[PDB]
Motif scaffolding. Structure first.
Motif, mmCIF file in Angstrom:
data_model
loop_
_atom_site.group_PDB
_atom_site.id
_atom_site.type_symbol
_atom_site.label_atom_id
_atom_site.label_comp_id
_atom_site.label_asym_id
_atom_site.label_seq_id
_atom_site.Cartn_x
_atom_site.Cartn_y
_atom_site.Cartn_z
ATOM 1 N N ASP A 15 0.797 -1.228 0.000
ATOM 2 C CA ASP A 15 0.000 0.000 0.000
ATOM 3 C C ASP A 15 0.836 1.288 0.000
ATOM 4 O O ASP A 15 0.457 2.265 -0.640
ATOM 5 N N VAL A 16 1.964 1.285 0.716
ATOM 6 C CA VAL A 16 2.907 2.412 0.687
ATOM 7 C C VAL A 16 3.504 2.592 -0.703
ATOM 8 O O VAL A 16 3.740 3.716 -1.148
ATOM 9 N N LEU A 17 3.752 1.473 -1.372
ATOM 10 C CA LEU A 17 4.376 1.467 -2.691
ATOM 11 C C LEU A 17 3.403 1.796 -3.831
ATOM 12 O O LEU A 17 3.805 2.405 -4.836
ATOM 13 N N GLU A 22 1.409 5.805 -7.839
ATOM 14 C CA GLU A 22 0.320 6.637 -8.342
ATOM 15 C C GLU A 22 0.632 8.121 -8.190
ATOM 16 O O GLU A 22 0.103 8.941 -8.922
ATOM 17 N N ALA A 23 1.495 8.457 -7.238
ATOM 18 C CA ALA A 23 1.916 9.837 -6.985
ATOM 19 C C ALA A 23 2.706 10.412 -8.148
ATOM 20 O O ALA A 23 2.872 11.636 -8.253
ATOM 21 N N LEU A 24 3.198 9.519 -9.008
ATOM 22 C CA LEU A 24 3.986 9.904 -10.179
ATOM 23 C C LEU A 24 3.112 10.342 -11.355
ATOM 24 O O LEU A 24 3.621 10.808 -12.366
ATOM 25 N N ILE A 31 8.338 3.416 -11.769
ATOM 26 C CA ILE A 31 8.622 2.399 -10.753
ATOM 27 C C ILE A 31 8.590 2.955 -9.313
ATOM 28 O O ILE A 31 8.991 4.100 -9.051
ATOM 29 N N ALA A 32 8.076 2.144 -8.388
ATOM 30 C CA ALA A 32 8.155 2.428 -6.952
ATOM 31 C C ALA A 32 9.040 1.361 -6.301
ATOM 32 O O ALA A 32 8.694 0.174 -6.291
ATOM 33 N N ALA A 168 5.602 -0.326 -12.434
ATOM 34 C CA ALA A 168 6.236 -1.351 -11.606
ATOM 35 C C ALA A 168 6.312 -1.013 -10.113
ATOM 36 O O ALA A 168 6.505 0.156 -9.714
ATOM 37 N N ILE A 169 6.147 -2.065 -9.309
ATOM 38 C CA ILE A 169 6.430 -2.042 -7.876
ATOM 39 C C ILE A 169 7.530 -3.088 -7.566
ATOM 40 O O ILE A 169 7.393 -4.282 -7.892
ATOM 41 N N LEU A 170 8.630 -2.626 -6.970
ATOM 42 C CA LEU A 170 9.713 -3.513 -6.554
ATOM 43 C C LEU A 170 9.867 -3.492 -5.018
ATOM 44 O O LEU A 170 10.266 -2.469 -4.440
#
Length: 177
Positions: A15-17, A22-24, A31-32, A168-170
């Motif tokens: 959820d933090v990621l 989405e903030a981008l 990528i987060a 992407a989420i890493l």
């Protein structure tokens, strides 16, 4: 809870990621990156080498044991068909370097999402050579919706997860082996 931040490691999660990503806003490739430090070592930021794309996040300077860093990246501006590809480098309090590869390509007909985690001896800043090692030579993991674990030597191991899409989420957790 934002991308420039160092948080309690236990607070690193999807959820933090998702919010960091989405903030981008609506870019094609972005990528987060979240990296949880449970290595017992204190990490100090060196740099991010961008093979492709960019970030204006100040790489979180000091990540103590039990702390996670939040980070982000995105493709270069303009109607170009590049993704966001880079290596993050942290020196650890043991004298070594934690290096993290992320690769979010533009062309999903020819390429895939990749990521890698490696420990180098001494303090190696991220550069083109390190990118080539992590990407081409060091068996990177695929953004394949799977958890992947591996020993890093130096009494450590890493566990990470990356999705397959261009947004992407890493999520990486570096622990003791």
């Amino acid at each position: 809870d934002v991308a420039g931040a160092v948080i309690d490691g236990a607070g690193l999660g999807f959820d933090v990621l998702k919010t960091v990503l989405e903030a981008l806003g609506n870019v094609k490739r972005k990528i987060a990156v979240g990296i949880d430090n449970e290595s017992g070592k204190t990490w100090t930021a060196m740099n991010t080498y961008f093979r492709s794309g960019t970030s204006d996040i100040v790489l979180p300077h000091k990540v103590a044991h039990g702390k996670a860093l939040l980070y982000n990246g995105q493709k270069n501006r303009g109607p170009v068909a590049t993704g966001v590809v880079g290596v993050i480098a942290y020196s650890m309090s043991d004298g070594n370097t934690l290096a993290v590869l992320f690769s979010v390509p533009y062309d999903y007909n020819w390429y895939s999402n990749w990521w890698n985690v490696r420990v180098y001896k001494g303090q190696k800043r991220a550069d083109q050579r390190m990118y080539e090692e992590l990407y081409y030579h060091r068996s990177p993991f695929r953004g394949d919706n799977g958890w992947h674990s591996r020993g890093l030597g130096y009494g450590l191991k890493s566990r990470g997860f990356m999705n397959s899409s261009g947004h992407a989420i890493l999520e990486i957790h570096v622990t003791k082996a």
